[PDB]
Amino acid sequence: GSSGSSGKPIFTDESYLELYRKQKKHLNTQQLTAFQLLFAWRDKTARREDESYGYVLPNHMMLKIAEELPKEPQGIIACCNPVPPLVRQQINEMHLLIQQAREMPLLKSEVAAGVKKSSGPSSG
């Protein structure tokens, strides 16, 4: 109102690679899929709620979730602490996204895993 041209909805960080390779353990096929789903969603709702993008969902959080890929809506609520009035309100939407990123298979990729450990002390 005071000062701000209504040019166009500039919603893009110049596809900054940093965002992708910001932290170790680069995102995999699926993880990536969800990452985009969340971003787009944030923008859509962001405008609807007449609020900024960040306010809705930050980067760190957005990632943590995309990486978790919780089949259930709870995994999305726990990711945050406390939980915002959004993620909880539109929780249903967020959940769906996670499933949309997991539903799809993992394109050819050499994976390697396998670990086993456990303990159990005692006094008596």
Tokens of 2: 């005071």
Query: Domain 16-105 sits in which CATH superfamily?
Result: HRDC domain (1.10.150.80)
**Cα–Cα distance, 124 to 115 (Å, whole number):** 30
| Contact indicator for 30, 101 with CB cutoff of 8 Å | yes
Amino acid at 10: I
> Cα–Cα distances in Å, from 61 out to 45, 72, 116?
16, 17, 29
**Cα–Cα distance, 75 to 36 (Å, whole number):** 18
The string of DSSP letters for 52-76 reads -HHHH--HHHHHHHHHH--SSSHHH
| Contact indicator for 61, 94 with CB cutoff of 8 Å | no
Method of structure determination:
NMR
Cβ neighbours around 118 below 10 Å, total = 4
| Contact indicator for 38, 62 with CB cutoff of 8 Å | yes
| Contact indicator for 109, 28 with CB cutoff of 8 Å | yes
**Cα–Cα distance, 112 to 124 (Å, whole number):** 41
| Contact indicator for 56, 42 with CB cutoff of 8 Å | yes
R_g over Cα of the chain: 18
In 3D, which of 44, 46, 80 has the Cα closest to residue 63? 80
How do the domains of the chain map onto residue ranges? 16-105
| Contact indicator for 62, 13 with CB cutoff of 8 Å | no
